[PDB]
Amino acid sequence: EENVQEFVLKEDCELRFAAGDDSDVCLELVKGYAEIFGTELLLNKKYTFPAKSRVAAFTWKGATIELVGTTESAYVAESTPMVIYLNIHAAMEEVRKKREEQAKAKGPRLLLVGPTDVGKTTVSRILCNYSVRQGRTPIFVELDVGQNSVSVPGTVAAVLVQKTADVIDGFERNQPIVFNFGHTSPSANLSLYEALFKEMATTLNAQIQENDEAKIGGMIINTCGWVDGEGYKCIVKAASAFEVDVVIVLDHERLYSDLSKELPEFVRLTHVPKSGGVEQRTGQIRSKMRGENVHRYFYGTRANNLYPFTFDVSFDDVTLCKIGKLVIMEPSADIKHHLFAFSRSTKADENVLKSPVFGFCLVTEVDLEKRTMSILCPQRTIPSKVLVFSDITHLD
Numbered sequence: 001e002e003n004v005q006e007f008v009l010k011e012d013c014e015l016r017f018a019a020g021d022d023s024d025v026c027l028e029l030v031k032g033y034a035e036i037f038g039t040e041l042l043l044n045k046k047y048t049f050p051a052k053s054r055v056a057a058f059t060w061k062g063a064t065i066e067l068v069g070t071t072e073s074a075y076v077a078e079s080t081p082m083v084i085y086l087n088i089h090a091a092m093e094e095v096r097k098k099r100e101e102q103a104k105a106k107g108p109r110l111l112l113v114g115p116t117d118v119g120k121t122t123v124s125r126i127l128c129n130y131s132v133r134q135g136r137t138p139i140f141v142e143l144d145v146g147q148n149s150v151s152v153p154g155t156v157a158a159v160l161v162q163k164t165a166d167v168i169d170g171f172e173r174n175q176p177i178v179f180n181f182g183h184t185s186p187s188a189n190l191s192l193y194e195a196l197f198k199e200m201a202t203t204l205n206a207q208i209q210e211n212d213e214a215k216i217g218g219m220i221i222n223t224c225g226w227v228d229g230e231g232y233k234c235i236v237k238a239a240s241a242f243e244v245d246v247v248i249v250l251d252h253e254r255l256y257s258d259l260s261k262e263l264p265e266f267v268r269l270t271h272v273p274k275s276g277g278v279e280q281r282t283g284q285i286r287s288k289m290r291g292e293n294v295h296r297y298f299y300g301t302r303a304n305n306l307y308p309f310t311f312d313v314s315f316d317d318v319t320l321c322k323i324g325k326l327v328i329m330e331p332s333a334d335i336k337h338h339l340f341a342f343s344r345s346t347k348a349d350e351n352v353l354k355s356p357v358f359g360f361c362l363v364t365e366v367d368l369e370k371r372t373m374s375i376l377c378p379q380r381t382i383p384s385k386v387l388v389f390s391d392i393t394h395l396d
Ligand SMILES: Nc1ncnc2c1ncn2[C@@H]1O[C@H](COP(=O)(O)OP(=O)(O)NP(=O)(O)O)[C@@H](O)[C@H]1O
Pocket: 016, 017, 053, 054, 055, 056, 115, 116, 117, 118, 119, 120, 121, 122, 123, 144, 147, 224, 225, 275, 276, 277, 278, 279, 281
């Protein structure tokens, strides 16, 4: 509402706060310098964070910050691993220059691993932002099909980062490369998951041959939290497929010891602690968040609204298929509420499995007698006649 809280942050402190369950909180930096997960704050700009937001504003040299509205929590932390996360960037940049002097230059590729809720996504964000602030253009690769910060759930995705994340909305989602996995966990089909990220690595390697800035920018790769059992071998295959030269393990000493013995000796492995400000989720909140991600795909944000179309499509004008080999689907009541991917492949081939997607639509109604379905779509006509099933559902 109207009530105010003021905070003085010494050097190397962060204001950690969570917005209430019900209302916005607005942050304003009123003296000094501060950043939120790597993005510089502008002085006296009012940043409106929505309900449930969890945020840290960090300062290297000292800051004073005002928060307007109700907070569930808000305190200043005097100890962070931020210098750790900064020295990782410094080290990547050092590799970049040496490899520039050695010459086109191939930038460092970094894999972030660790269990759930250790601040992995936040750390990728910081590292991407610090690369941009250095003048570089890194590729952010997102292998977490549950909580994906680039596309919808059930995807493996990658974007070229050319600007710092917006403090509220995250990175711009401009022309991502997107593969439809179709499930919220790799365990649903681990062999397909591994095939998809291998196809992702192969595609990116050939893409960067046509863009030197992207090539030297390198890659920051976020993984999911499945580190045990089969998840472990999956980490090793990802390290190999993407030819990473740095693995950052967050808050897992056994995983660190195991990887140190297994990875090629040329790979640098760094164990770092999680921040004390990382919030543990539950399954319910994770589900809630997947739904909000899908909504954002179609409708956008408060800052940048997207205006999707709803229209009807004849069963005759599209072919529905499902992976798991390809199988063709006869449109039924059960496709209702499901996301489908518009495949870049021209027919319902073997090639559907290997192909990135144009984008997604949501099947909102199924008229079996009229033989038409209603879809929510980011564009006015379908970009492809090959629609690939995702097990992710969304009530809108
Ligand atoms: N230093 C911090 N202070 C306050 N909040 C933070 C901090 N670091 C992370 N968070 C918040 O904690 C939540 C979880 O962080 P996140 O970086 O998604 O962890 P994660 O390891 O990627 N989770 P998952 O991928 O679901 O296993 C997010 O809302 C962040 O904004």
